[PDB]
């Protein structure tokens, strides 16, 4: 497929989100679903468009699978690639580290030369701090299944519509 979606998940929430995003784009012919646990950093070179999904764990940390491959990301040339991000988090229980993982990954990947696409508004959330916020916007789609499960479907539909334009679809 033209778009490669790489996700990491601990309790399965991020995977379900990834599956809905794939479905919203039109299926396997449009988006390849890849678990980062089974991937090598170089697998990311094969796509011009990437979607990175990662839930925040422990104290504002990367999901373990993303944690593992983090240092290897330096070996991938991201120049010219357009990358979107999404993450699962808990704004109530971790109000000081909401969606930190997504922020940590975007900081690293954008520093390697990629173009971030898919900024999302912060107004629909209530949190104190997040490493995923830049100039009053999230760097990617923030999902909260713990506190706002009723908003997920529409958030995904809206975000995917937004990305289609930016990914040339
Ligand atoms: C031990 C623990 C630590 C967590 N830490 C954070 C955090 O620092 N920031 C955040 O936004 N969410 C945090 N969360 C919420 C999770 O990211 C959230 O439950 C998410 O749906 C987990 O996704 P997964 O099933 O894909 O791994 C934490 C949850 C648990 C159980």
Curated annotation (Swiss-Prot):
Induction: By iron stress.
Keyword field: Electron transport, Flavoprotein, FMN, Stress response, Transport
PROSITE patterns: FLAVODOXIN, FLAVODOXIN_LIKE
Cofactor (UniProt): FMN
GO molecular function terms attached to this record: electron transfer activity; FMN binding
Domain Flavodoxin-like: 3-164
SUPFAM superfamilies referenced in this protein's UniProt entry, alphabetically: Flavoproteins (SSF52218)
Acyltransferase among keywords: no
Matching NCBIfam families: flav_long, PRK09267.1-2, PRK09267.1-4, PRK09267.1-5
Entry similarity comment: Belongs to the flavodoxin family.
PANTHER family: FLAVODOXIN 1 (PTHR42809:SF1), FLAVODOXIN 2 (PTHR42809)
Protein name: Flavodoxin
Annotated source species: Synechococcus elongatus (strain ATCC 33912 / PCC 7942 / FACHB-805) (Anacystis nidulans R2)
Name of encoding gene: isiB
